[PDB]
Design a protein around this motif. Structure first.
Motif, PDB file in Angstrom:
ATOM      1  N   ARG A 176      20.433   5.653  34.014  1.00 30.83           N
ATOM      2  CA  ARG A 176      19.480   5.763  32.995  1.00 30.83           C
ATOM      3  C   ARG A 176      19.716   6.266  30.945  1.00 30.83           C
ATOM      4  N   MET A 177      19.500   5.558  30.624  1.00 30.38           N
ATOM      5  CA  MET A 177      19.316   5.494  29.117  1.00 30.38           C
ATOM      6  C   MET A 177      18.592   6.170  28.135  1.00 30.38           C
ATOM      7  N   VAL A 178      18.847   7.457  27.647  1.00 31.89           N
ATOM      8  CA  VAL A 178      17.568   7.984  26.932  1.00 31.89           C
ATOM      9  C   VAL A 178      17.873   8.072  25.443  1.00 31.89           C
ATOM     10  N   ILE A 179      17.298   8.115  25.000  1.00 30.92           N
ATOM     11  CA  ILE A 179      17.838   8.478  23.002  1.00 30.92           C
ATOM     12  C   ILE A 179      16.435   8.730  22.701  1.00 30.92           C
ATOM     13  N   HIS A 180      16.484   9.365  21.289  1.00 32.36           N
ATOM     14  CA  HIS A 180      16.152  10.383  21.266  1.00 32.36           C
ATOM     15  C   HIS A 180      15.578  10.659  19.483  1.00 32.36           C
ATOM     16  N   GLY A 181      14.342  10.211  18.483  1.00 32.46           N
ATOM     17  CA  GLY A 181      14.203   9.859  17.494  1.00 32.46           C
ATOM     18  C   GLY A 181      13.163  11.164  16.492  1.00 32.46           C
ATOM     19  N   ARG A 182      13.799  11.399  15.515  1.00 37.14           N
ATOM     20  CA  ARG A 182      12.490  12.324  14.608  1.00 37.14           C
ATOM     21  C   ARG A 182      12.276  11.779  13.391  1.00 37.14           C
ATOM     22  N   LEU A 183      10.892  12.326  13.215  1.00 34.87           N
ATOM     23  CA  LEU A 183      10.253  12.492  11.910  1.00 34.87           C
ATOM     24  C   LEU A 183      10.106  13.380  11.060  1.00 34.87           C
TER      25      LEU A 183
END
Length: 183
Positions: A176-183
């Protein structure tokens, strides 16, 4: 290159989104449109009362192994601190399969933004964490900041983008791949 019923439905919804049609009148669970730079992730995001209904249901609520990208049922607004979206890692390189492209260090160093399109507004999130393996509610700033340190050190690569408790985070997790982005 496989052409099946699921890729036809998704390709047709991308056209309707391009033609600025109201996708909510097709499915009232529709919330926003999601795309990731330099990937084929370009799909609608729905939301049910749980985190399982759209695992095997397409945008027209028919049976589909690809399902539909769905946001966590606990999330309420675009102003929530962690927005979580779930999608499948399909073998035909669709849905959240291209999250694996963030395993590449050179691809990760390139700033590929997560784009949420909602009510004629674009919300750009810069990816800062990606790894192989999720909280929506934070009581205070300490719990949120601890969550930020948790997912930042979990990243396979150090990101030039740093994140603090004054940012909003979007999370794309495979189901399972997981990525995170930020604003």
């Amino acid at each position: 290159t496989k052409y099946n019923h699921d890729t036809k439905i998704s390709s047709e919804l991308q056209k309707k989104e391009y033609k600025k049609e109201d996708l909510s009148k097709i499915n009232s669970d529709f919330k926003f449109w999601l795309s990731v730079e330099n990937t084929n992730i370009n799909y609608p995001v729905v939301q049910s009362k749980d985190n399982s209904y759209y695992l095997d249901k397409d945008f027209y609520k028919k049976d589909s192994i690809s399902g539909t990208l769905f946001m966590d049922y606990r999330n309420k607004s675009i102003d929530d601190k962690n927005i979580i979206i779930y999608g499948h890692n399909m073998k035909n390189k669709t849905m959240f399969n291209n999250l694996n492209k963030f395993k590449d260090a050179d691809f990760f160093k390139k700033n590929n933004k997560i784009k949420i399109t909602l009510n004629g507004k674009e919300f750009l999130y810069d990816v800062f964490s990606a790894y192989i393996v999720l909280k929506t509610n934070f009581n205070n700033e300490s719990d949120y900041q601890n969550y930020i340190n948790d997912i930042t050190s979990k990243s396979l690569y150090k990101s030039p983008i740093k994140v603090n408790s004054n940012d909003k985070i979007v999370t794309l997790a495979t189901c399972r791949m997981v990525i995170h982005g930020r604003l």
